[PDB]
Design a protein around this nucleic acid. Structure first.
Ligand SMILES: [Mg+2]
Ligand SMILES: [Mg+2]
Ligand SMILES: [Mg+2]
Length: 155
RNA sequence: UCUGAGAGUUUGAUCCUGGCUCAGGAUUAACGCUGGCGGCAUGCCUAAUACAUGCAAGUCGAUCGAAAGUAGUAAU
C-alpha cells in the first residue's frame, strides 16, 4: 500500500526552430507509512506518462526510515542548496505541524508528531531534498552506543 | 515541564539573490448594508477650545451670646 501524492506539477518548455516544445513535470512522493519513502521527478509530453515514469523512478530509489515513539529523535537541520529545513522532536499529540512539500514527506514516511519550519527557499525539490537529507543524517541511540561503548543508551 | 505551517509574483523554461502582496490575530475604532433579545465590559483618541443653565463639602445648640416660633398666668 505505497500511497503516492503529487507535490508539484510544473510546465517546462524548450524552444525549437518555431514553436515551443511543452512537457509536464511531476514530483511524486511514495510512502508505505511504515518507514519506506522515496521521491521521483519525471518529464513527459502528457501528465499520465509523466506520472508513471515519476512513480517508477520514486519506487526505484526507496530509503529506509526509523521512527522513535512516532516522532523524530533529535532536532536536525537539513541543507540542500539554499533551502534549510528545521525538524524538531514533538510530544505525542501535536500532530504534524508541517506544511507543503515537507508535510507530504513526513506523512508519507510514517512520522506523526513533528515540528518543522522552512528557513530557506520555497522550491519543492530542494525542500524535499533538505527534508530527506535531515532525516537521513539522523543518529539512532543504539549506533552511538556501539560507537561510544556505552550501555545501549543507558545514562 | 516549553516549543515554530505557507503561497502568489522577474524568465521561452530553470536555479539563486531580492522587494511587494496574501492566508492569522487585535483596537477607546469609524463608514456602507442590514438588524430581535438577554448576561458582562467599554464609550471626545480632536479644540489643556469657549461655555448658557441646574447640582458636585460640609458638620456640631452636649462650645457661646442673641434672635425667632410654638405652648404656658408666670417661673419656664
Ligand atoms: Mg529559422
Ligand atoms: Mg513570465
Ligand atoms: Mg491577513
Amino acid at each position: 500500500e505505497f500511497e503516492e501524492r503529487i507535490v508539484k506539477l510544473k510546465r517546462i518548455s524548450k524552444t525549437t526552430k518555431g514553436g515551443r516544445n511543452m512537457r509536464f513535470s511531476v514530483l511524486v512522493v511514495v510512502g508505505n507509512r511504515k518507514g519506506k519513502i522515496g521521491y521521483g521527478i519525471a518529464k513527459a509530453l502528457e501528465v499520465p506518462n509523466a506520472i508513471k515514469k515519476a512513480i517508477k523512478a520514486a519506487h526505484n530509489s526507496l530509503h529506509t526510515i526509523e521512527i522513535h515513539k512516532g516522532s523524530i529523535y533529535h532536532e536536525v537541520i537539513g541543507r540542500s542548496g539554499a533551502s534549510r529545513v528545521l525538524l524538531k522532536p514533538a510530544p505525542q499529540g501535536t500532530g504534524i505541524i508541517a506544511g507543503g512539500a515537507i508535510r507530504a514527506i513526513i506523512e508519507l514516511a510514517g512520522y506523526s508528531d513533528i515540528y518543522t519550519k522552512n528557513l530557506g527557499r520555497n522550491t519543492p525539490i530542494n525542500m524535499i531534498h533538505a527534508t530527506m537529507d535531515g532525516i537521513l543524517k539522523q543518529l539512532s541511540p543504539r549506533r552511538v552506543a556501539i560507537l561510544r561503548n556505552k550501555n545501549l543508551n543507558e545514562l
